[PDB]
Subunit: 273 residues, 5 copies
């Protein structure tokens, strides 16, 4: 019944319920999510000394982000399985009040760790030319926080009030665009003065960044990307968490690995294998 300002996963769960496939996949993909993060934490810790001292902060901040991501995805995995429970007579999983409603907002507030750190860490690997370290940092952190907070507010209304949903997301999108702007600037300046091999890694980082970060606004909109459409369903629920997981792995783990490799490159006298 009355769900109020809740995520659409609950409305699907309280009305149609989820098939075995939809319920199991979502639980598996979230579990895959946190396993990758913990493993990633290990990777980043064990490779600290593969780069020169001054680049090591980047490994450290990658680890920091792994810790946050693992904790969150682990909790979000337990929340999924607590929120939906098998009805034997129907053969589907339905909303289970005593489990709490499912809410993606857990992710959002944790981005207050992830986003600032991911943006920050590249500043310990590349060299700026025109732009100033503290200034890029502050721009990254202000815009990151605003983006997140406004998106956080909006997602609570994804069902109860489409207008607020779309307005807060548009506002949040403005801050996102600024971030893309500043990061492209940072990538370019970071290319100045370094080896082709290093420039190549930076170019890959920019494509990865652009695509992986754009997946998140995609996950925000997922339920409506097909207009009472195909995605406003358990299919859209699965797709949302799939997109999140692909994005987390890409934006966090792969991103950090590439930065580490750029760092090996820029290090004397170390080279990639």
């Amino acid at each position: 019944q009355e769900l109020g300002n809740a995520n659409f996963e609950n409305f699907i769960g309280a009305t149609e319920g989820f098939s075995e496939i939809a319920y199991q996949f979502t639980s598996h993909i979230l579990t895959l999510g946190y396993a990758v993060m913990l493993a990633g934490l290990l990777y980043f810790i064990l490779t600290i000394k593969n780069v020169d001292k001054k680049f090591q902060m980047s490994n450290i901040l990658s680890a920091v982000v792994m810790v946050s991501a693992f904790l969150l995805l682990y909790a979000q995995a337990q929340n999924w399985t607590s929120s939906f429970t098998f009805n034997e007579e129907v053969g589907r999983y339905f909303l289970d009040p005593s489990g709490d409603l499912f809410n993606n907002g857990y992710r959002y507030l944790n981005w207050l760790i992830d986003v600032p750190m991911l943006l920050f860490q590249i500043l310990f690997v590349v060299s700026l030319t025109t732009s100033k370290f503290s200034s890029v940092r502050n721009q990254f952190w202000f815009s990151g926080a605003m983006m997140i907070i406004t998106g956080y507010i909006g997602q609570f209304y994804e069902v109860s009030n489409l207008t607020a949903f779309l307005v807060w997301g548009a506002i949040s999108s403005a801050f996102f665009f600024h971030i893309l702007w500043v990061m492209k600037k940072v990538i370019n300046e970071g290319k100045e003065g370094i080896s082709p091999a290093g420039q190549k890694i930076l170019s890959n980082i920019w494509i990865l960044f652009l695509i992986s970060w754009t997946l998140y606004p995609g996950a925000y909109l997922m339920p409506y990307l097909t207009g009472d459409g195909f995605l406003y369903s358990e299919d859209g629920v699965m797709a949302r968490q799939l997109v999140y997981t692909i994005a987390d792995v890409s934006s966090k783990v792969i991103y950090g690995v590439l930065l580490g490799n750029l760092a090996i490159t820029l290090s004397k006298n170390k080279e990639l294998v």
Copy 2:
């Protein structure tokens, strides 16, 4: 509903209940709280060797605080989610007896670890002049203990007895002012004998300490800061936990980072 000497979160949850936003936000913010601490733990451990040996005890102590803060904030997060349970009829979360009442007391007793350590660790980075190490340490430790223990007793009565609440709070404040007094002295003496860049960091630390520590009494009084005011509601519950989380992150993590940076400047190693 007989709740007795319980925090006001339980009275709101037992009467009005919590909206989806109030219950979820409070849970997210408590969850961000403990995630920050475990993340911070890693940071402080992995940066120990960025400062001269004589300063590394500050990093170690920052790490120790992170361990404690993670455990307690993790527990406090679980306390929140099991104390309130969704009612499908009206779509609000209400007090769930079988999960225990919710109490902010976990956090308070955490301070019994953290406060002594956070005040203690700056003494491993700065050098005192006219003050004696042991005498400062002792005043930090005693006044901190009394501040927290008196506040801890007091918060049990925030609803059941407003007079005891305020009187214990008032007493707690007196020890707080003493710690502020002692800390400013430590910071001033620490400025002596070090470079201006170091002095600049200590100034930032003092302002951070001042603002972040004052937030806690703010959180103490939160429900009544608007008088049956606007904050005597789920909004006040949200604001209280938000303020705690900001204060913990500031007084623990940012404080630790600034001390580490100070230790780097003082180290015969530079900043970026």
Copy 3:
């Protein structure tokens, strides 16, 4: 009896139930599973420096795989004990809806981490010759992904739609054969130049790889390997989890140890 697209473990659980020996053994073997992985993690971390710097990425990748494996086998172990509950009247464990249906899928998405990593780590130990580092990797990774993803879809139908089960299994099997193809090529190129002890180990790694990886298709089909036969029963359920656990220990822990030993010979003496 409305289970939908669910693993056969649930049908057995919901109809016959499991004997004490069947329920316990399956619980014990899953438990040994995740204990071995955590044990292995510690081993691989502590022996990183036993090889030359350039080989150490393989040790690291082994540790990384152990983390992922421990977490998933631990969860899978809990999935098991949560899904089936003792009935005191007949002395058997039956399906318990409130605990969620049991699904092996946790284990399949684990493979998305482990498979790409395992195939990858060998390239950090041996030298290629005619084919390039990036091309092998990319074929390993693409083929592994497709293998896992098609097998994953297939296992949901292992009872509800036998055809889908077999088709998806076959498609998956194609990418598997492709992987076996590239790998043997990798093993072969890797044998050139190195001492005799090293080629031997590699030959073992290849036998280990071929057997352990073939075990997974066996577990996939287990319940039907005797046709409603002997393995379409709790005995089939025990066998499947026993085979997964042997496979996983072989393909990740034993495989990793050998690669480590190879790296020591190419460095330091055993």
Copy 4:
């Protein structure tokens, strides 16, 4: 019908616990295990602050922390599962499904802590006329006997007062022997070291004497005021408060002081 159970369950089964009694007890158990895990990190991270020959003492502190953390963590959960809130009267009552609460968990775990704590001082100080192995054996035997006898006794703290007292008395005898040996060890360790080192060892002795004596205090607690004030939720709170003060003091502070002594004895200076 509770049987040979700790008095906590009798209070919990009849009068119940107030919000403050129940919350405090849970909080103090939680502080306890948090301190232990924090301490584990401290002792590991400071190993290299003393000469190699002293580092075993850090390692043994770490060992004790692992032990104390696990047990206090378990006991914290045991407390909250054993007593459940009753909404009609607003008190927490015994909840059998959670199991009866028992302090005996602590006792068996002292079979790790006690021997390791007594042992570790011998890797920091130097004996003079006494032998390392003899002091070790004395400590270890008396420690085991002290713990086992008390373990047995506490099961009868309500069901059989006489047994409770007799086993406690026997346990105390071994305790007194341990105090005797430790004092001899402290005195010997003072011979030939700097006054800074001697001062610490003196503090270690006072700390050791008070903190260890707190444990028999916790044992007797329900009866320390005779159906008195402490035979109630107040004595339940006090017993756990006392255990936690004792744990932090006997384990952490002790370990920190031994580490400081090791620094003074390292040829490394005390900040």
Copy 5:
């Protein structure tokens, strides 16, 4: 009522039930068990560098055994407390279906890690003379696995089929003697060419090994060691888990510590 092929713990628990002391003790001893192992894990990790590089694999293997033993003993502790639940009307803990039946087999399959590793590790400390590393290792691993698997099968029948219980146990014991035979040869060869101090430690390791490992077959038979006798009861239940815990600590931790000490004496380092 209908238990099938289940350990006798479940039969006692379902018929007479467990007293507070029997239930709490068994829980306490299991908790001390996993606590010792995790503490051991730290010790072995933290002492690796106290021996020459060639011997450090023995530490690593000791650590491997600790992780495995902690995990299993922790799981088994939780299974004890969820399999038996308090009945307030009677004052005893009875079988609780929904917690699953209790089974020691968890422990047995865990040995497939510990046994091969414990046997293997001594070969990174001692030097063989006439025997080959590989042959000994293979003999240890094959006989170990067969010992475990045959015993594991046997214990499922400890109540439901005395005949199979003893037959499978007898078979298991055959492989056990073989292991004893091989280990004795390994210890004799390891004594060759080393200082008497080292020889002495090896002699202790042998006695420790002989005794601690033999405790396991004792635990297997425990309920019948006194014939419907004394030990077929909650006392036998207590005794069994006590013996496992003593055995695990001795065979794992103390064994591991002596090997470390042996490694130190052989290291070109002193104890």
